[PDB]
Amino acid sequence: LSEARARLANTQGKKAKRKAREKQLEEARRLAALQKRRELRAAGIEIQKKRKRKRGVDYNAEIPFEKKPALGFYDTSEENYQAL
Amino acid sequence: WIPRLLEDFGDGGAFPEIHVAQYPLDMGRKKKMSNALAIQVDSEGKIKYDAIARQGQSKDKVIYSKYTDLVPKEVMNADDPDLQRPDEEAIKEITEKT
Amino acid sequence: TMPKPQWHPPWKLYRVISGHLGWVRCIAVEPGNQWFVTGSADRTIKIWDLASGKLKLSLTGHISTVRGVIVSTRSPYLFSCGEDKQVKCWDLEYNKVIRHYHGHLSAVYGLDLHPTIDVLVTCSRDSTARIWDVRTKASVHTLSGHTNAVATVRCQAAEPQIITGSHDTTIRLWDLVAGKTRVTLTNHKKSVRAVVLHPRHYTFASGSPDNIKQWKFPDGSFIQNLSGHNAIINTLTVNSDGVLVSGADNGTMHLWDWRTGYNFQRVHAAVQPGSLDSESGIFACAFDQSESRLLTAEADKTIKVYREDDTATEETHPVS
Amino acid sequence: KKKRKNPDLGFSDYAAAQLRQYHRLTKQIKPDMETYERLREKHGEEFFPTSNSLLHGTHVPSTEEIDRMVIDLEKQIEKRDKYSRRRPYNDDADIDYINERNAKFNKKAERFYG
Amino acid sequence: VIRMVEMQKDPMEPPRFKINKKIPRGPPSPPAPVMHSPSRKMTVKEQQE
Amino acid sequence: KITDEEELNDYKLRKRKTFEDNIRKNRTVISNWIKYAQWEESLKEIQRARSIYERALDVDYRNITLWLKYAEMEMKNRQVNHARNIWDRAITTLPRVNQFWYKYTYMEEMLGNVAGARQVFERWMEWQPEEQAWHSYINFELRYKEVDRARTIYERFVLVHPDVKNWIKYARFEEKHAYFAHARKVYERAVEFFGDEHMDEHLYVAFAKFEE
Q1: Domain total for chain F?
Q2: In this complex, which of D35, D46, D51 lies closest to F112 when CB atoms are compared?
Q3: Which of C29, C40, C88, C247 has the highest CB neighbour count under 10 A?
């Protein structure tokens, strides 16, 4: 009965179990690294892992693929927006 | 008298003999460069909103964007020489060029 | 209203050919009018006699549905096009494929031939058309710009030289040399699967489940509607006498007057014995070269031939 | 004294609900003929433009105005946020589902197989 | 005034540059205006159907 | 909680690469594009939001939720003129979708630009839209007094939609505001317009009610 209860409750794709575990698994990797990275650079050594990733900074450095809005019959020049 | 506020222009006008830079009815002053594209107007005084759909395109583009493009033209005529294919000589020219 | 439409006599079915083993999807007539050719979803191409209705020959090269055939007026060639992404050139003095045009990325939905120069145009489901050079099998242009399968293509000698209708409900008129769209017509609300050009009038018509529309070359200025046929319309076909045949996908076929747009007959044929009634549908129609017979290729694996009725008059069948 | 009623029906098209909402919002607004006449005496004949007739470059709004439309924006946004009324987590009835996706699929099946 | 002369190509020389680069496709053309006929209504009963 | 600059920037990077891979993955259903732009606006990085909406409209411009979310985003952030350019592009390319005209006019009314709202209503009526649009225009003219404009609109209206019911509404309008001679003229024009071969009850019923 317990094992029948076991089988009937496992709806998530048996791999959909695993990768669900993996998503929370790696959060150790990043969470551990950062504090240890914080502490490492806090100890006074500015380690670089290395810089080689082709499309990574395509997100946080620049507008990924920028399309600026078209202009029409009105002046958009003076508009500017606040910060967070 | 040296006109400084455009009210002194009455209906408008610059005083060429008056040694002042006349700015009559918003005249004279170079303004900020704004983004607004040229609010054009047709050959009858209508507001040619064809512009904003034609955004950044040649004049070869035929752009249907008016209501009058939807209305059934009354071309129930078997006769009009408006619609008859180009004479085969022009077709021969197009064929050679192509 | 309108002046009143010309009287055309009505058409009656007089022959039913059945030898295919899958839907019949395309049909064409030879230049010299002796035989016609059908391509079907059983991957054969059959060649029938037009007088007797006898089957002359069966060509089997494709790997899937043959979705278009055409016979060239300048050379002894038959060009066929399938869902296997391949386009073929059959030479009709040996009955064998001599040339194949490669490069489409999904099924090819239709194909037409240029009447003066030797090029081919094909439309496919990758939402492009291509202009092929008949002689060197090289793709000289990829007409791209639609955003969904390109249901149909027709080409002409005048200008613009290519009209394509696609499933993203748009028509485009292209120039052959430059290779880009001059005009985009977005009047239809549903996929445009049918386009036809008037033989002698510099106008054309485009069919959709909403209604057929007429347009006027060379920049496609709207002319009028033709409404009443509420069905997925697979074909349009125009006679030289202004009869326009609109064949739908539930089997029903309307016959219209081209000039005034007056629907003067509605044919609702019957399905072959062993067929279901959910399997009545017209995929292609073609007028004879004499423009006397009208052949239709149907989803119940038959070819139905209609001829005009000779014993009727304006007072037997008046025009409403 | 006044009286009226408006009953809800099928969502038939998104247009119908949009239109109802516009009706409500329109009825709410109250315009100041003061500012209208003030704006009027400045511009006169420009007030009555056809689609194609007249043109003045741009009308620049006092910020205080802009706040009105922003506030109405936030209001309509909230009212829209409440579109779907949720039915409270009732455990009282028999459980055959294994997760909330399965529970909702079973509910859709209940509507279509009676 | 300048004299253009085209430099000889070495017969035995392989291609020089990497051709295969992938990028997403550009923006299309300016969207054309949708010239439809006005929409009609679907009753609740039809959506039931 | 994110202490500061580098940690929330990594947080940005992770969410951002997640969004961008979703978009690369499907490039279609616009739930992804809208989720993404909603987030980049919630962080008040609205230039990225504008780029996202623009790219989305490049994917599928016939989608009306996209246009509405976009103009809403511009309007909340007080970018009035951006919102105006957007409404203008929208009613230019999708002129049959009525929501756009409604909301454009409503905004311009809130903002106090009544001349602008009339400009938009006129452009709209060029398309001969539908009775509800004409009603909306007339009600707009009636929140302000401008009753002569209202009857001008009604003249165009009953020609565009020649139904007996509309002629009735027109007459009813002018009587409610006490122009009795004019309402009589309306009724006589109605009868002479329709002609016998169609003419039926409802019209006469209302005509009798008026004269009674």
Answers
A1: 1
A2: D35
A3: C247
